[PDB]
Amino acid sequence: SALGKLQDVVNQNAQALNTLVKQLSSNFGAISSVLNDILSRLDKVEAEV
Amino acid sequence: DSFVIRGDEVRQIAPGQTGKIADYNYKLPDDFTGCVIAWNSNNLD
């Protein structure tokens, strides 16, 4: 617990990168977050939206 | 560009479509700028 300042910096970098990767799984209103699903589920006009 | 199709096929005459006519006869590009004009000519038959 003495090194709390340095371990906090390492934790915040890991937390930020894990959050950035976890956000690839999110839909944002899209029919799937897996991009190859969208390109195989739909016709090109709907897929681009 | 002008031609005659069955009435059910007219839906395929739009940018980025798929189907027999859009695959094998007349394809519009995805960035098409233009108008598609169509009417029944059933009185000619």
Q: Which single residue is written with the structure tokens 């371990």?
A: A7
- Using an 8 Å Cβ cutoff, are B42 and B28 in contact? no
- Using an 8 Å Cβ cutoff, are B10 and B37 in contact? no
Task: Specify the 3-state DSSP secondary structure of B23.
Answer: helix
The reported resolution of this PDB entry, expressed in Å, is 3.1
Chain A residues whose CB is inside 8 A of the B18 CB are: 43-44
Compute the nearest-CA separation of A34 from chain B (Å): 22
Distance of alpha carbon A37 from alpha carbon A31, whole angstroms: 8
Alpha carbons within 13 angstroms on the beta-carbon side of residue A24 total 6
Q: Tell me if chain A has a CB within 8 Å of the CB of B16.
A: yes
Distance of alpha carbon A11 from alpha carbon A22, whole angstroms: 16
Single-letter amino acid code for the residue at A18: N
Subunit contact A43:B15, Cβ cutoff 8 A: no
- Using an 8 Å Cβ cutoff, are B17 and A43 in contact? yes
Q: What angle do CA A8, A10, A12 make, to 5 degrees?
A: 65
Distance of alpha carbon B1 from alpha carbon B21, whole angstroms: 14
Distance of alpha carbon A44 from alpha carbon B17, whole angstroms: 7
Q: Tell me if chain A has a CB within 8 Å of the CB of B1.
A: no
